[PDB]
Amino acid sequence: PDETPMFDPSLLKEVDWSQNTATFSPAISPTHPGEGLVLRPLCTADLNRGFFKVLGQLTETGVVSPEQFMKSFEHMKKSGDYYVTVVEDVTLGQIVATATLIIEHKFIHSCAKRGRVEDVVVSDECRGKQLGKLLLSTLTLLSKKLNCYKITLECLPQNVGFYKKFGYTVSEENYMCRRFLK
Amino acid sequence: PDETPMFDPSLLKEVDWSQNTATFSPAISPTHPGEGLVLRPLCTADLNRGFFKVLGQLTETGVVSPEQFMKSFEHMKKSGDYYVTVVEDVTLGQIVATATLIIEHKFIHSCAKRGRVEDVVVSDECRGKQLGKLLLSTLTLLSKKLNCYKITLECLPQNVGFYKKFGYTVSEENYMCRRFLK
Numbered sequence: 001p002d003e004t005p006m007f008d009p010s011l012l013k014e015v016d017w018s019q020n021t022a023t024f025s026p027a028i029s030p031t032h033p034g035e036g037l038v039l040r041p042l043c044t045a046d047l048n049r050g051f052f053k054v055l056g057q058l059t060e061t062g063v064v065s066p067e068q069f070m071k072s073f074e075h076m077k078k079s080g081d082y083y084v085t086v087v088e089d090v091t092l093g094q095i096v097a098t099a100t101l102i103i104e105h106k107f108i109h110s111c112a113k114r115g116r117v118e119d120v121v122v123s124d125e126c127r128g129k130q131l132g133k134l135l136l137s138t139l140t141l142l143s144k145k146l147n148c149y150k151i152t153l154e155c156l157p158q159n160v161g162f163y164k165k166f167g168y169t170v171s172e173e174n175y176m177c178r179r180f181l182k
Numbered sequence: 183p184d185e186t187p188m189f190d191p192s193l194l195k196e197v198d199w200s201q202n203t204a205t206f207s208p209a210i211s212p213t214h215p216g217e218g219l220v221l222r223p224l225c226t227a228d229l230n231r232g233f234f235k236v237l238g239q240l241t242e243t244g245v246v247s248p249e250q251f252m253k254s255f256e257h258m259k260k261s262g263d264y265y266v267t268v269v270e271d272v273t274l275g276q277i278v279a280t281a282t283l284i285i286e287h288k289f290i291h292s293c294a295k296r297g298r299v300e301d302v303v304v305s306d307e308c309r310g311k312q313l314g315k316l317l318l319s320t321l322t323l324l325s326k327k328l329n330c331y332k333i334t335l336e337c338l339p340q341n342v343g344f345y346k347k348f349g350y351t352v353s354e355e356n357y358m359c360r361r362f363l364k
Contacts, residue, residue, distance in 0.1 A: 055290050062292040072293045079261050082287070104284060105264070108237050108301065109363070110244035111254040119290065140360060149363045152336075154355040168358040173336040175353040176345050178322065181291070181331035 001048065001066065005041035006077045006084050012039060012138065015145055020137045022165040024130060030138050034129055036091040039138065042084040042098070044073055050094040051086065058121045081105070083142060087122075087131050097122040099135035101142055101151075115143030115151035133165070140166045183230075183252060187223030188259045188266050194221060197323045204319050204347045206312060212320055216311055218273040221320070224266040224280070226255055232276045233268065240303040263287070266301075267321060269313055278305040279313040283321040285328060297325035297333035315347065322348045 017029045033039045042051070047069050052061060076082035080103070087097035099120040103113050117139055122131045143151040154175050155163055194212050215221045224233070229251055237243050258264035263286070269279040281302040288294045299321055304313045325333040336357050337345060 052289070059290055061290055064289065064293050068293050069289070072287055072289060076287055079263070080257075081261070084289075102286065104298075104300070105254055105258055106301065107234070107246070107251065107254060107266075108241050108243050110246055111250045112363075116286075118286075119288070144362050150359060150361045152357065152359045154353070155358055156354070157356055160356050160358070163358050167360040169360070171336070171357045171359045172338065173357050174339055174342060175334065175336060175355045175357045176342070176350040177332060177334045177353045178348065178350045179332045180326050181294075 001044040001070070003043050003045050004077075005043050006073065006082060007041050007080075009040055011083075011142065011145065012041070012085070015138060015141045017141075019141050019144070021167050022133050022137050024133065028130060028134055030134070033087060033131070033134060036089055037096075037129075037131075038088045038090055039134065040086060040088065042073070042086050044070055046086060046088075046095055049088065051098065054095050054098055054121055054123055055119065057124060058119070083139070085135060085139060087135070089126070095123075096126045096129075097131040097135060099139055101139040103143070103146060103148065109149050112149040113143075113147060115139075115146070115148040117151065117153040132162075136163070136166050140168075183226035183248065185225050185227055186259075187225045188255065188264060189223050189262070191222055193265075193324060193327075194223075194267070194320065197320055197327060199323075201323055201326070202319045203349055204315050206315065210312055210316055212316075215269060215313070215316060218271055219278070219311070219313075220270045220272050221316070222268060222270065224255070224268050226252055228268060228270075228277055231270060233280065236277050236280055236303055236305045237301070239306055240301060265321065265324060267317060269308075269317070271308075276305075278308045278311075279303065279317060281317040281321055283325055283333075285325070285330065291331055294331045295329055297321075297328070297330040299333065299335040314344070318345065319348050322350075 083101035089096045100118040102116040265283040268277045271278045282300045284298045
């Protein structure tokens, strides 16, 4: 378990924030998430930084073993297709938000990449920090930078408005789903 | 460009075909797709068995390079996460249908895998040969055996009756989208 990021952190700091289409108030950015905050890729030491306690808020996982974490991490890391991003409160040394960008590869559209935004969560006692908006914008604009032809996500109809702020529109296509688990 | 399949063909035959819920008249299978038809992993040779001709029936496939193709294929094969499956018409040597199962890795649900179905297309002269149904049942069931806790896809509302066949249900969730290319 080390500090080695999943992707090159230059990728985040080189994102053109002028291209952000959402209302920030106060105006924050990836470079300046807020007092005592760092927006960065996930690394292996984040295991001990309450990363699962932030994910698990969204949905109760089972005890993921350290070994299991590093395998998942490494496969994701050297795929080049996962951009698991985290906000750290440095003053407490804990993770306080996370969101994932997945690059999918296709053959259609000149062998193009499309993005998927997955697993956007912000810690319960850490609302009003705009880290949801912040991660969404960052991750959205990160996919453009990675030259995705498009980027998609699922949301509840109630938050359908929250996402229009990032350039997203409601597709006429339905999301369809089959559970094997439960 | 050679016959090297993207994943193990074994994976296809080991799909528990007794678990298919969809109707087939006549009863066709991963082993018996029809007279003169084989169901297999994509391989690089497929380039000139008109793979891109079929995909062209799904969506614009700009000037695609044999090399840009070969590279993309390799990355998908190297990940172990891409299951681009095709039907060759072994007699006429052409691909006549494709669909892809992408395996997606999580940290949630005890570092679970979920699957997506993408890029389902049947050549415009393979109607009545039941290939849509077959591909969609095969990968849905392949995802089960690969241990996906769920599998999902996106379709027009009018295509809904079709995917229910394999026990997909419409989600309560909006599918939202940003296009970068136009």
